[PDB]
Design a protein around this ligand. Structure first.
Ligand SMILES: [Mg+2]
Ligand SMILES: [Mg+2]
Ligand SMILES: [Mg+2]
Ligand SMILES: [Mg+2]
Ligand SMILES: [Mg+2]
Ligand SMILES: [Mg+2]
Ligand SMILES: [Mg+2]
Ligand SMILES: [Mg+2]
Ligand SMILES: [Mg+2]
Ligand SMILES: [Mg+2]
Ligand SMILES: [Mg+2]
Length: 115
RNA sequence: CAGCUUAACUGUGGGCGUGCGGGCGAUACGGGCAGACUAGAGUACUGCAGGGGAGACUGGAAUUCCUGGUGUAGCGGUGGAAUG
């Protein structure tokens, strides 16, 4: 089909980073990830896979005909700016930037400290 | 001091003998007794800040889960990987 506007969702952890593009109504057009790009071990952790998923989702969404996108990012830093710049260079221009990160107001208890 | 020749020893009466008694005469501090005062203490008049304590009521973000859409091959993980 086609869509004149949508939002690309970004959630990036230390060891992963996925990208999914959704319309405002909540129906997803397409998604991409480093794992699908084919990176295992620490390879996937790179922002490089971030830009790869970036232009991948760009292609698989612009096939459906996405024009305007607003990206939301979350999670700890793994290349957020790198991925957004790669997407911008991919040919899609964002109208507004927004970060909504899961920040629980001291709900539940995090797992023990690493050792 | 006194003599056994000096010798241990004792011949010698004083002196020593740290505790306990009543009678004569003290009152400074150290108790009880005695009435009064307040520099401690305590309440009394008005203000104060506070996650002090107990019960109940209530909001938010989030994890997880159930249900339902969009949606595609992996998601997740560590120095890496498989159990998942
Ligand atoms: Mg990792
Ligand atoms: Mg863990
Ligand atoms: Mg003599
Ligand atoms: Mg004598
Ligand atoms: Mg004695
Ligand atoms: Mg007394
Ligand atoms: Mg008086
Ligand atoms: Mg007083
Ligand atoms: Mg107060
Ligand atoms: Mg109680
Ligand atoms: Mg569902």
């Amino acid at each position: 089909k086609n869509v004149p506007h949508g939002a690309a969702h970004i959630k990036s952890t230390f060891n992963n980073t996925i990208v999914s593009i959704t319309d405002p109504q909540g129906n997803v057009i397409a998604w991409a990830s480093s794992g699908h790009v084919g990176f295992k071990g620490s390879r996937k952790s790179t922002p490089f896979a971030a830009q790869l998923a970036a232009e991948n989702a760009a292609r698989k969404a612009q096939e459906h005909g996405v024009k305007k996108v607003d990206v939301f990012v979350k999670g700890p830093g793994s290349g957020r700016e790198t991925a957004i710049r790669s997407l911008q260079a991919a040919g899609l221009e964002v109208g507004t930037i927004s970060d909504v990160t899961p920040q629980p107001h001291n709900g539940c208890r995090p797992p023990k400290r690493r050792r």
